[PDB]
């Protein structure tokens, strides 16, 4: 039916990376071969990453296209795949992608990633309500989420290295499961308190002073939220799932919420203001025990010899001189001081 057809892939798919994808997926001799509208409408999935495709003019034949990964090559214009509209999964990462408007009408997108992309614009994606899994990591020029709002289905997203500030739009995402929020300009997370699913959270390198909002999070598995400024722990003595923590490099001097998380495997604190530890003798499940630049001293070192599932043991730069309680700890396999 459609005119331009049957043609030779290179004269279709006028990107050499791109053709021979074409050529490699229809597993023709050559790039010069001609390919029918019926062999085009049979790729239902093209991978065509880590190349230098500069073009994907021709994609638009592929209309029976669910899958396609163009993940590291060189695509500044994605105006073709603006009607493959049966696509569910979209790689796009690592490229050249500034304007997304092509994806509005990709309504029966369920993963999209867009990663280390130059987007700043992303009000392409509001229709896109089917939205599962989202990787907008590494826009640096980033900072609106609104049009995000309406992804009430939406189980896993990235957002880092951005300008984004303002989480507001993030509190609608009630389905979320895991969340990224690295290295961002965020300063306040209290609209986050609506995220009740989340299990794995990770806002790292951010201007957080306050984690009341993570008191909602009651089955939060993973938290990890260093360098910060936060002081106040209490919001996290109720997670009773909490496996592993990192909140290394904040404003924390009291560890006494922790008490009574006893899944805990993983607990990194290095660079606080702690001086007492005697909540740990509690946590005897612990693995990995991070308290390296805080304010403790040989007084505090008998509680993290009766840890005797200790594997790594970080106390450098505090107040030690006598680490003989800590000969107990009989599965050392990591530990930042010279002597043992």
């Not at 009766?306 to 043991?313: A, E, K």
Request: aromatic share 4%; charged share 15%; net charge negative.
């Amino acid at each position: 039916t459609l005119a331009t057809l049957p043609a030779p892939i290179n004269q279709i798919f006028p990107d050499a990376d791109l053709a021979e994808g074409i050529r490699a997926v229809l597993q023709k001799a050559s790039v010069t071969d001609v390919v029918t509208q019926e062999e085009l409408e049979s790729i239902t999935k093209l991978v065509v990453a880590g190349e230098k495709v500069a073009s994907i003019q021709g994609i638009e034949y592929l209309t029976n296209l669910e899958y396609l990964n163009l993940n590291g090559n060189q695509i500044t214009d994605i105006s073709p795949l603006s009607n493959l509209v049966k696509l569910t999964n979209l790689y796009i990462g690592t490229n050249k992608i500034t304007d997304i408007s092509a994806l509005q009408n990709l309504t029966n997108l369920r993963e999209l990633y867009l990663n280390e992309d130059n987007i700043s614009d992303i009000s392409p994606l509001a229709n896109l309500t089917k939205m599962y899994s989202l990787n907008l990591g590494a826009n640096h020029n980033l900072s609106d989420l609104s049009p995000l709002s309406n992804m009430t289905g939406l189980n896993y997203l990235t957002v880092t290295e951005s300008k984004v500030k303002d989480v507001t739009p993030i509190a609608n995402l009630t389905d979320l499961y895991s969340l990224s929020l690295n290295y961002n300009q965020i300063e306040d997370i209290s609209p986050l308190a609506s995220l009740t699913s989340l299990h794995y959270f990770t806002a790292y390198v951010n201007q957080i002073t306050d984690i009341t909002p993570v008191a909602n999070m009651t089955r939060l598995n993973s938290l990890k939220i260093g360098n910060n400024k936060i002081t106040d722990l209490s919001p996290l003595a109720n997670l009773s799932q909490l496996t592993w923590l990192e909140i290394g490099t904040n404003q924390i001097s009291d560890i006494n919420a922790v008490k009574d998380l006893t899944k805990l495997k993983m607990l990194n604190v290095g660079s606080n203001q702690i001086s007492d530890i005697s909540v740990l003798n509690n946590l005897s499940q612990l693995n990995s025990l991070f308290l390296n630049n805080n304010q403790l001293g040989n007084e505090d070192m008998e509680v993290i010899g009766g840890l005797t599932n200790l594997t790594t043991l970080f106390l450098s730069q505090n107040h030690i001189t006598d680490i003989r309680p800590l000969a107990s700890l009989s599965k050392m396999d990591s530990a930042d001081f010279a002597n043992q």
